Design a protein around this ligand. Sequence first.
Ligand SMILES: Nc1ncnc2c1ncn2[C@@H]1O[C@H](COP(=O)(O)O)[C@@H](OP(=O)(O)O)[C@H]1O
Lengths: 7, 253, 242
Amino acid sequence: XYXXXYX
Amino acid sequence: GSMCWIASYPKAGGHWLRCMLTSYVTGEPVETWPGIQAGVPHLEGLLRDGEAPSADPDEQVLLATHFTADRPVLRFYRESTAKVVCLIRNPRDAMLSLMRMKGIPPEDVEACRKIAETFIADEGFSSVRIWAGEGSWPENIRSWTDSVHESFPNAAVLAVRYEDLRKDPEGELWKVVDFLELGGRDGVADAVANCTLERMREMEERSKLLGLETTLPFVKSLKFMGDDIEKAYADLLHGETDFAHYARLYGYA
Amino acid sequence: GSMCWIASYPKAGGHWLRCMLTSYVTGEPVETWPGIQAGVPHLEGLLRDGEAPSADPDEQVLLATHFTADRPVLRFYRESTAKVVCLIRNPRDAMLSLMRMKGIPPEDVEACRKIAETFIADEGFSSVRIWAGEGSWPENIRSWTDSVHESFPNAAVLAVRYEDLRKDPEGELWKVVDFLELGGRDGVADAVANCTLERMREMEERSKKSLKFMGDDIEKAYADLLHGETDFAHYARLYGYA
Ligand SMILES: Nc1ncnc2c1ncn2[C@@H]1O[C@H](COP(=O)(O)O)[C@@H](OP(=O)(O)O)[C@H]1O
């Protein structure tokens, strides 16, 4: 993983 | 040349291929969610930490990425790359997959249409801020398959379809394992049993219960929201863009 | 070689350093926020996009980072790195800085406390999700200064306190310019004027205290650290933060 956003 | 990529577009089934690949090498299951990341490290995740695998190692290495092959950062592995496994999935289903991952129940048309319509305009997930450097669906595909030698002049490619894998898990994991020369085959049936749908949900929850670094739940077709959107996809699908060209080729027309 | 780093722990006024530097190299003012990333790109920013400048590139290149010099990814630049600027600020202010950012109005007791509690236990921002690979405060300084040669064997280092820049913008900026060999001195004036606190907050938007309060116990906690046996006290002392 290693995933962005902002939620 | 001992570097090997599991390249894939977001939501093609990367964790699963990733999870079965680890199981086969370890020989035992994967008991915990970052075991996946331990096993077939996802490049992006390694960079967040400032980690990076050695350029040019002596014995075989397996990484995963959603990057187009041409993205500068990969220039570093230009000669060390021996093998590419390109995992591909129906774009209709990748799009649906993001809605499920975002939460969003199949009723909220407004909510779903927005993603769907954005998906169609962008020919993929480029506007979704969850990933970067992936390009559009066809862009990705082109760079790993048709163009791979523009980025890795020494590489050989296997392609594998998400759907082939669901239909014949053990036969398909085998192509990938034989391609990458990871060895046996009696190992194959086991790896599949370990990284089942069921096994995976529980393996997600157990991690999640032991307050662990996990990627809100993580683990159908077109009629429901549309007409307007049905035609919109169809037009893209059977149109004259490179998307169409690839959708036709992997049999999604 | 020809690679140059503006290295700094998060919240040490790296943005401003970069802004000013971008303004001097360009001559013109900074047309706004992304301008900063175009000029002195932040390496994390680039890797997120899959972007990464080539090792051994034949003309001078300036990047920024919060990584410790010893992070595996900087390894590709091991040989080709010539110059490091290491920007350092009172870790008392960095901490207070995360707060304003994280939103909190200074009279939110249990909210400040916790972050402060954490910062002191960690000696920096290890437990703060916004950054990664930056290590702890001493660790970061150590690796870019006293131990720089363990990562960048051909590099020279100019260390620079945020507080000295604030006390003399043009003098200190020119010390950085001079060290990097970007030319004159004359430019240095305008560049400071092109990136002042005002032009800054304006570039952020047209794009898109001390330990007194609640101290008693915390104040103590911090001060015990600041006069501890650790690498945190070493650098505090050494940079006048004690
Ligand atoms: N063990 C498994 N078997 C089959 N599909 C799986 C699986 N584990 C994950 N998937 C599916 O792979 C998709 C996510 O892909 P990625 O891991 O690359 O983001 C999701 O599809 P759906 O959401 O369509 O069910 C997810 O449920």
